[PDB]
Enzyme design. Sequence first.
Site, PDB file in Angstrom:
ATOM      1  N   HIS A   2       0.837  -1.220   0.000  1.00 56.44           N
ATOM      2  CA  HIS A   2       0.000   0.000   0.000  1.00 56.44           C
ATOM      3  C   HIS A   2       0.865   1.261   0.000  1.00 56.44           C
ATOM      4  O   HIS A   2       0.379   2.338  -0.288  1.00 56.44           O
ATOM      5  CB  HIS A   2      -1.000  -0.064   1.233  1.00 56.44           C
ATOM      6  CG  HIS A   2      -0.542   0.626   2.500  1.00 56.44           C
ATOM      7  ND1 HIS A   2      -0.260   0.138   3.692  1.00 56.44           N
ATOM      8  CD2 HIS A   2      -0.352   1.989   2.589  1.00 56.44           C
ATOM      9  CE1 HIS A   2       0.082   1.117   4.474  1.00 56.44           C
ATOM     10  NE2 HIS A   2       0.024   2.232   3.809  1.00 56.44           N
ATOM     11  N   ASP A  13      -0.339  -7.288   2.398  1.00 60.43           N
ATOM     12  CA  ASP A  13       0.399  -5.995   2.367  1.00 60.43           C
ATOM     13  C   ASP A  13       1.913  -6.052   2.554  1.00 60.43           C
ATOM     14  O   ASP A  13       2.427  -5.514   3.513  1.00 60.43           O
ATOM     15  CB  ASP A  13      -0.280  -5.070   3.460  1.00 60.43           C
ATOM     16  CG  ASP A  13       0.120  -3.587   3.316  1.00 60.43           C
ATOM     17  OD1 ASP A  13       0.361  -3.170   2.198  1.00 60.43           O
ATOM     18  OD2 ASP A  13       0.158  -2.935   4.343  1.00 60.43           O
ATOM     19  N   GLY A  44       2.573   7.255   8.448  1.00 61.87           N
ATOM     20  CA  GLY A  44       3.997   7.608   8.198  1.00 61.87           C
ATOM     21  C   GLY A  44       4.841   6.433   8.719  1.00 61.87           C
ATOM     22  O   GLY A  44       6.019   6.319   8.438  1.00 61.87           O
ATOM     23  N   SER A  76       3.974   3.143   8.289  1.00 60.86           N
ATOM     24  CA  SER A  76       3.767   1.982   7.384  1.00 60.86           C
ATOM     25  C   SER A  76       5.049   1.448   6.764  1.00 60.86           C
ATOM     26  O   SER A  76       6.000   2.201   6.605  1.00 60.86           O
ATOM     27  CB  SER A  76       2.782   2.411   6.260  1.00 60.86           C
ATOM     28  OG  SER A  76       1.521   2.369   6.931  1.00 60.86           O
TER      29      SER A  76
END
Lengths: 9, 245
Positions: free
Chosen positions: B46, B97, B196, B198
């Site tokens: 993502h 992810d 921020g 991730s």
Amino acid sequence: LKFQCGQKT
Amino acid sequence: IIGGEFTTIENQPWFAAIYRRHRGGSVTYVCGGSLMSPCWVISATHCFIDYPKKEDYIVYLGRSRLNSNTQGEMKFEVENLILHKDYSADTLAHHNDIALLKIRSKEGRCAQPSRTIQTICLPSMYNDPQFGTSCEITGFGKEASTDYLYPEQLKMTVVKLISHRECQQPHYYGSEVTTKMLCAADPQWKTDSCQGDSGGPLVCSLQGRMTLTGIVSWGRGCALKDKPGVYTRVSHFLPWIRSHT
């Protein structure tokens, strides 16, 4: 020197 | 990170800062990552999903600050950007992810080992710590969900892993969390990962090693009661990582 995963120095 | 402490990269030397260049002269921070081997960094899909143009990202290793230099830092280009096929997003979660970035320096090399640059270890097939384990997350994400800028100094905090039973309780996330995810919170919901953060790592000790157990993926708000942070369960993706590295 070479990478040793997980180590902090 | 909400709460936490400010640190330097010597304490997380496998952490990678991923930025994006803009046709305008500015470079902005995107997400965090970790070094698996000299030429491979792992993060979340993502983080690239909306602009999968590898040529526009820069990866720095050995960086204690966000927009100022750290001596000993290395800058790389993404030679390969591998996102997950089966990546989905719903009204909260992101499934599958995980992403891989092969890096290349402007001299034809990959990362070099230093006091500020090291690799982190991968678990073994579906092997995770027991819920309860305290793991640490690191990154430059928001310090309050209402802020609009990121900190300039690296931060870190310790959070604990919880069970799926606990995270899939209706007043938590129900069945939005699946076995390929892991949830981690602070018992007193004080610290947590945030926007921020991730792509960045959730490291825990496993069989003696500091292992990459999770990748910061999603969460409702940041440090919200009964809203744990959800991470990608790395131990369940080992085959995938392997077929590409």
